[PDB]
Amino acid sequence: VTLRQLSNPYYVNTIPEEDILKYVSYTLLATTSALFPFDHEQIQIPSKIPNFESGLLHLIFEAGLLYQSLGYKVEKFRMLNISPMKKALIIEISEELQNYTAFVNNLVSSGTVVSLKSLYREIYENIIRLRIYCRFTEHLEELSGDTFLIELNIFKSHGDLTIRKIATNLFNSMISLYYEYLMNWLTKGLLRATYGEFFIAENTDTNGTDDDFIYHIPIEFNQERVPAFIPKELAYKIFMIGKSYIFLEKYCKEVQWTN
Amino acid sequence: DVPMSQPLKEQEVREHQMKKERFDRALESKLLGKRHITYANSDISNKELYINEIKSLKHEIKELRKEKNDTLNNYDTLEEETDDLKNR
Amino acid sequence: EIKSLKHEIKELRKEKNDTLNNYDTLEEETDDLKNRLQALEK
Amino acid sequence: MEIKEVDDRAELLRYTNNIPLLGKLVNHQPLWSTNPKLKSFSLEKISAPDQRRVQEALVVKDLLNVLIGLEGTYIRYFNDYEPSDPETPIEFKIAKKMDPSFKTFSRRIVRYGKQYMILTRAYEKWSDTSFGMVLQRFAYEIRRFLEDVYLKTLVERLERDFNKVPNFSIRELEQIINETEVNKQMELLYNIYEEIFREIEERRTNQSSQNESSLHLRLMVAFDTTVYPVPKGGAILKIFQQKILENLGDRSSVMFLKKLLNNISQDYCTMLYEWLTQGILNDPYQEFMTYDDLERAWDTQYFIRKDVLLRDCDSEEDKNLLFKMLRTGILLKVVRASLQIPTIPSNSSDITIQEINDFADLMEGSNLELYVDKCYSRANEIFLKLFFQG
């Protein structure tokens, strides 16, 4: 006879793979599961499942809990106001989350995998990516865009390829808006929506010396905020370009030529 | 035969080169000693992976602390079972 | 003083490992008496 | 088997920074010795030849569970195993009522699974930056192996044979594994990892311990004899090289060795090509054997990391070659600083340097010397032109 019959009386009190899948569908979707009573933090797995199967379902529900915690974090960060670079970072995180959601939905609807080992081997890449995103969001609520790009360029030097790829994607999405700020300041002299992420700032804090800015020129050039990928001479040139543009538009009244 | 005598031109050019080399090395050691050997006393740190604090160890301590209790608890249970089964 | 606390915690871990060895010999005794139970029942 | 009731709850590990970026972030399942979920069945009831098939099937199942790092019913974790400790020794206790031949086969397979778990934790820890991206790449490659060779072959052969193949024996399973030779590859990689760990230990032993041609040269060059606790840079690749020197006679062994060596040292030869063609220094992991200060006002002192060297630089020829390469890079950096250019295009002279693809062929061959002499002559030409005309 088959080996299944030899071990049949040993697992007569276990859950078949069908209900296992039917309820892991609910559990990984952050929804409640009747077979596995799911708490906000605890999966609360019954003891009927073997211990090695318990470990594999622990990994699966770890992926599910990473997804749920990433959803909680993205909801929290969406409820808070952030810089447009942080907005694009949140957009990238939500894109990764919805891609993983579509992936697991295709896995559930298709159901081509028959061995949970090969299933875990297939989903291991997405599990690692979700773990990376959680490791990143652990300190996301603290660092600014400059430290963001620093860590991204660092991880682009990492020996791994997935971390380097994600870091490059986020670096590009942030440097797009950085170049947008640069172009805004270079074309109109505008510090609008910079969120302090720009090395030139406006300083109207006067102590009585030229309160009307007849000669004060209330513009400051922060050398420390100048990133490494731009020379200090070029940053000073950009600052002087913007300052001279504002000087022509406000003092010289050369509206047409400046326009 | 007999051991050949060391050449005269050879010893002359050798003493000349050796005098020149002694002078050159003295002058080089006199001129600030450009030769140096250093030891690397610096390491890079990458904030996102750089641990904000090692206090997690004590945290892990607490964690292991809890685990300790569990072991004890389990031990007790096993004892009971043993005794129970022993009575059987 | 943190290193001394970690050393004391490691000593506590060693004591708990001794308790775990006691648990292991208790477990092997339990397996032996379970085999005895199964033999005397059947 | 009677189901035993234990509170199994999976929670995410709250603190993860002390865990490697590739380390597991979930709690481990309870142990059979501590919180069993099924009542074990005595093997002496099925140690008879008529029931030997049931015992063999259960042993094969437990072995397949062990190969992925999970525990079973008869082969449980050892007494010293700690599921919450990443560095604890992971051994196993096999049921004493098992068949002797089955016991030997289970010992072999549990050794394979233990090597798998050890290499898993190894590349997980190696995901840290302290080990160097190069080693990280190696770590990655290891995982790649475990993601493409070990687990794939396991699930494709052994699970299928244990599920839908009657008359299957554990001897046939061991013979199939030996045919796949993934066990032999894992054994050799485990030997390599043991040698690497022993080298780390030896670097930990010598805690207190760690030429006139440099003064002859008008260069602000210094030595950096700092030894790292773990091998980094060429010290890693040399090991691979040494392994190639120790795996001669087996073609597949040397093939896989050179494959991994090239896949890992691609980044290092790219960095070396950048240094020798542009003088651009970028070593965020301290894996290159050349770094300077100012990362005396205009003069920066270059330091040669002795631990991440590519050669011993003990002979006069090797020392002169290293001096020539360092001087080439320094002249490139000086030309870039004087011309205020980020990079030097190849059209600046009639000499071109191609990028290195195979590190082993570059080492054993003189094409490295060809490239070095070519770029050195190019840099000398450009520098002499700029100083005689500019």
PDB file of C-alpha atoms in Angstrom, chain A residues 1-4 6-7 9-11 13-14 39 41-59 61-63 65-66 69 114-118 120-122 124-125 128 131-132 134-136 138-139 154-164, chain D residues 1-12 16-17 19-32 35-38 41 46 53-54 57-58 61 64-65 68 70-73 123-124 127 133 136-137 140 143-144 146-147 151-152 155 159 162 165 267 284-285:
ATOM      1  CA  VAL A   1       0.000   0.000   0.000  1.00  0.00           C
ATOM      2  CA  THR A   2       0.957   3.670  -0.141  1.00  0.00           C
ATOM      3  CA  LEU A   3       2.940   5.384   2.603  1.00  0.00           C
ATOM      4  CA  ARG A   4      -0.056   7.650   3.260  1.00  0.00           C
ATOM      5  CA  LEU A   6       0.876   3.755   7.012  1.00  0.00           C
ATOM      6  CA  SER A   7       0.731   7.235   8.581  1.00  0.00           C
ATOM      7  CA  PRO A   9      -4.012   6.932  11.928  1.00  0.00           C
ATOM      8  CA  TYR A  10      -1.219   9.235  13.126  1.00  0.00           C
ATOM      9  CA  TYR A  11      -2.746  12.375  11.566  1.00  0.00           C
ATOM     10  CA  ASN A  13      -6.747  14.719  14.027  1.00  0.00           C
ATOM     11  CA  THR A  14      -4.995  17.125  11.633  1.00  0.00           C
ATOM     12  CA  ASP A  39      -5.149  38.323  16.822  1.00  0.00           C
ATOM     13  CA  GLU A  41      -0.225  40.436  16.839  1.00  0.00           C
ATOM     14  CA  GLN A  42      -0.617  36.696  17.535  1.00  0.00           C
ATOM     15  CA  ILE A  43      -1.631  34.081  14.984  1.00  0.00           C
ATOM     16  CA  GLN A  44      -2.729  31.730  17.806  1.00  0.00           C
ATOM     17  CA  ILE A  45      -2.091  28.531  15.867  1.00  0.00           C
ATOM     18  CA  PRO A  46      -3.779  25.382  17.230  1.00  0.00           C
ATOM     19  CA  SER A  47      -1.554  22.516  18.332  1.00  0.00           C
ATOM     20  CA  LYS A  48      -3.149  20.017  15.923  1.00  0.00           C
ATOM     21  CA  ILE A  49      -0.613  20.991  13.233  1.00  0.00           C
ATOM     22  CA  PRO A  50       2.799  19.246  13.401  1.00  0.00           C
ATOM     23  CA  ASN A  51       5.770  21.234  14.652  1.00  0.00           C
ATOM     24  CA  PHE A  52       7.656  21.358  11.346  1.00  0.00           C
ATOM     25  CA  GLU A  53       4.408  22.297   9.637  1.00  0.00           C
ATOM     26  CA  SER A  54       4.043  24.736  12.537  1.00  0.00           C
ATOM     27  CA  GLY A  55       7.374  26.289  11.565  1.00  0.00           C
ATOM     28  CA  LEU A  56       6.528  26.561   7.878  1.00  0.00           C
ATOM     29  CA  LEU A  57       3.181  28.165   8.707  1.00  0.00           C
ATOM     30  CA  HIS A  58       5.097  30.395  11.126  1.00  0.00           C
ATOM     31  CA  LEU A  59       7.147  31.619   8.171  1.00  0.00           C
ATOM     32  CA  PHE A  61       2.191  33.984   8.771  1.00  0.00           C
ATOM     33  CA  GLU A  62       5.393  35.956   9.359  1.00  0.00           C
ATOM     34  CA  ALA A  63       5.151  37.132   5.758  1.00  0.00           C
ATOM     35  CA  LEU A  65       2.200  39.834   9.541  1.00  0.00           C
ATOM     36  CA  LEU A  66       4.942  41.770   7.749  1.00  0.00           C
ATOM     37  CA  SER A  69       2.424  45.794   9.715  1.00  0.00           C
ATOM     38  CA  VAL A 114       1.354  21.323  -4.643  1.00  0.00           C
ATOM     39  CA  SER A 115       4.287  21.201  -2.176  1.00  0.00           C
ATOM     40  CA  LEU A 116       4.422  23.882   0.508  1.00  0.00           C
ATOM     41  CA  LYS A 117       8.223  23.704   0.317  1.00  0.00           C
ATOM     42  CA  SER A 118       8.268  24.822  -3.318  1.00  0.00           C
ATOM     43  CA  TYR A 120       7.841  28.891   0.204  1.00  0.00           C
ATOM     44  CA  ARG A 121      10.795  28.763  -2.188  1.00  0.00           C
ATOM     45  CA  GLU A 122       8.745  30.747  -4.714  1.00  0.00           C
ATOM     46  CA  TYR A 124      10.906  33.612  -0.459  1.00  0.00           C
ATOM     47  CA  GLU A 125      11.946  36.523  -2.678  1.00  0.00           C
ATOM     48  CA  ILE A 128      12.826  38.944   1.778  1.00  0.00           C
ATOM     49  CA  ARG A 131      11.420  42.089   5.401  1.00  0.00           C
ATOM     50  CA  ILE A 132      13.682  44.685   3.770  1.00  0.00           C
ATOM     51  CA  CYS A 134       9.978  46.596   7.257  1.00  0.00           C
ATOM     52  CA  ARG A 135      13.640  47.080   8.201  1.00  0.00           C
ATOM     53  CA  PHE A 136      13.532  50.340   6.244  1.00  0.00           C
ATOM     54  CA  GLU A 138      11.557  50.896  11.237  1.00  0.00           C
ATOM     55  CA  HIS A 139      13.516  54.168  10.989  1.00  0.00           C
ATOM     56  CA  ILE A 154      25.028  53.184   0.705  1.00  0.00           C
ATOM     57  CA  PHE A 155      22.753  50.224  -0.052  1.00  0.00           C
ATOM     58  CA  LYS A 156      23.466  50.699  -3.757  1.00  0.00           C
ATOM     59  CA  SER A 157      27.055  49.781  -2.864  1.00  0.00           C
ATOM     60  CA  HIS A 158      25.818  46.693  -0.994  1.00  0.00           C
ATOM     61  CA  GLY A 159      26.935  43.293  -2.230  1.00  0.00           C
ATOM     62  CA  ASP A 160      23.341  42.123  -2.580  1.00  0.00           C
ATOM     63  CA  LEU A 161      21.384  42.922  -5.734  1.00  0.00           C
ATOM     64  CA  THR A 162      17.801  43.321  -4.489  1.00  0.00           C
ATOM     65  CA  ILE A 163      18.758  45.830  -1.785  1.00  0.00           C
ATOM     66  CA  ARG A 164      20.855  47.741  -4.320  1.00  0.00           C
TER      67      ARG A 164
ATOM     68  CA  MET D   1      -0.174   9.756  17.502  1.00  0.00           C
ATOM     69  CA  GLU D   2      -2.110  11.633  20.179  1.00  0.00           C
ATOM     70  CA  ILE D   3      -2.254  15.384  19.573  1.00  0.00           C
ATOM     71  CA  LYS D   4      -0.750  17.255  22.522  1.00  0.00           C
ATOM     72  CA  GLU D   5      -2.044  20.746  23.267  1.00  0.00           C
ATOM     73  CA  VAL D   6       0.432  23.642  23.399  1.00  0.00           C
ATOM     74  CA  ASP D   7      -0.108  27.370  22.848  1.00  0.00           C
ATOM     75  CA  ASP D   8       1.428  27.982  19.421  1.00  0.00           C
ATOM     76  CA  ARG D   9       1.402  31.701  18.575  1.00  0.00           C
ATOM     77  CA  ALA D  10       3.535  33.343  15.882  1.00  0.00           C
ATOM     78  CA  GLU D  11       4.611  36.939  16.504  1.00  0.00           C
ATOM     79  CA  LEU D  12       7.036  39.201  14.684  1.00  0.00           C
ATOM     80  CA  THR D  16      15.295  43.506  14.398  1.00  0.00           C
ATOM     81  CA  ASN D  17      18.439  45.672  14.268  1.00  0.00           C
ATOM     82  CA  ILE D  19      19.166  40.615  13.665  1.00  0.00           C
ATOM     83  CA  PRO D  20      20.979  40.728  10.303  1.00  0.00           C
ATOM     84  CA  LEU D  21      19.042  42.375   7.494  1.00  0.00           C
ATOM     85  CA  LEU D  22      18.618  38.881   6.013  1.00  0.00           C
ATOM     86  CA  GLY D  23      17.956  37.263   9.392  1.00  0.00           C
ATOM     87  CA  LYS D  24      14.623  35.770  10.370  1.00  0.00           C
ATOM     88  CA  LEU D  25      12.195  38.113  12.132  1.00  0.00           C
ATOM     89  CA  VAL D  26       9.724  35.575  13.576  1.00  0.00           C
ATOM     90  CA  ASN D  27       9.720  33.408  16.685  1.00  0.00           C
ATOM     91  CA  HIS D  28      10.524  29.717  16.325  1.00  0.00           C
ATOM     92  CA  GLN D  29       7.970  26.973  16.885  1.00  0.00           C
ATOM     93  CA  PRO D  30       8.009  25.127  20.229  1.00  0.00           C
ATOM     94  CA  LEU D  31      10.359  22.175  20.591  1.00  0.00           C
ATOM     95  CA  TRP D  32       9.212  18.555  20.669  1.00  0.00           C
ATOM     96  CA  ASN D  35       6.301  21.394  23.978  1.00  0.00           C
ATOM     97  CA  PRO D  36       5.458  18.390  21.797  1.00  0.00           C
ATOM     98  CA  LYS D  37       2.387  18.636  19.589  1.00  0.00           C
ATOM     99  CA  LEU D  38       1.992  14.905  18.863  1.00  0.00           C
ATOM    100  CA  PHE D  41       5.125   6.396  18.654  1.00  0.00           C
ATOM    101  CA  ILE D  46       7.852  -0.987  13.933  1.00  0.00           C
ATOM    102  CA  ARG D  53       8.696   0.074   5.827  1.00  0.00           C
ATOM    103  CA  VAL D  54       6.644   2.235   8.206  1.00  0.00           C
ATOM    104  CA  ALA D  57       8.990   6.124   5.768  1.00  0.00           C
ATOM    105  CA  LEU D  58       8.755   7.978   9.082  1.00  0.00           C
ATOM    106  CA  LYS D  61       9.881  12.165   6.573  1.00  0.00           C
ATOM    107  CA  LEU D  64      13.182  15.730   4.910  1.00  0.00           C
ATOM    108  CA  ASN D  65      11.976  17.924   7.773  1.00  0.00           C
ATOM    109  CA  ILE D  68      15.132  22.346   5.769  1.00  0.00           C
ATOM    110  CA  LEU D  70      12.884  21.698  11.096  1.00  0.00           C
ATOM    111  CA  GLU D  71      12.482  19.034  13.765  1.00  0.00           C
ATOM    112  CA  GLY D  72      10.491  15.816  13.567  1.00  0.00           C
ATOM    113  CA  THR D  73       9.233  13.061  15.876  1.00  0.00           C
ATOM    114  CA  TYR D 123      25.181  34.062   5.022  1.00  0.00           C
ATOM    115  CA  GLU D 124      22.512  35.740   7.161  1.00  0.00           C
ATOM    116  CA  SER D 127      24.690  40.180   5.179  1.00  0.00           C
ATOM    117  CA  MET D 133      30.097  43.510   0.280  1.00  0.00           C
ATOM    118  CA  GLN D 136      28.118  39.577   1.123  1.00  0.00           C
ATOM    119  CA  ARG D 137      28.101  38.672  -2.566  1.00  0.00           C
ATOM    120  CA  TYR D 140      24.306  35.978  -1.626  1.00  0.00           C
ATOM    121  CA  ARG D 143      21.792  31.692  -0.628  1.00  0.00           C
ATOM    122  CA  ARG D 144      21.491  31.507  -4.413  1.00  0.00           C
ATOM    123  CA  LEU D 146      20.403  27.132  -1.387  1.00  0.00           C
ATOM    124  CA  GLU D 147      17.645  28.772  -3.434  1.00  0.00           C
ATOM    125  CA  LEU D 151      16.053  23.232  -2.027  1.00  0.00           C
ATOM    126  CA  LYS D 152      15.111  22.816  -5.692  1.00  0.00           C
ATOM    127  CA  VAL D 155      11.743  19.218  -3.394  1.00  0.00           C
ATOM    128  CA  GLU D 159       9.713  14.690  -1.583  1.00  0.00           C
ATOM    129  CA  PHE D 162       8.727   9.761  -0.639  1.00  0.00           C
ATOM    130  CA  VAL D 165       7.039   6.098  -5.281  1.00  0.00           C
ATOM    131  CA  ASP D 267      32.950  44.206  -8.163  1.00  0.00           C
ATOM    132  CA  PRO D 284      33.049  52.140   1.257  1.00  0.00           C
ATOM    133  CA  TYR D 285      33.792  48.668   2.676  1.00  0.00           C
TER     134      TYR D 285
END
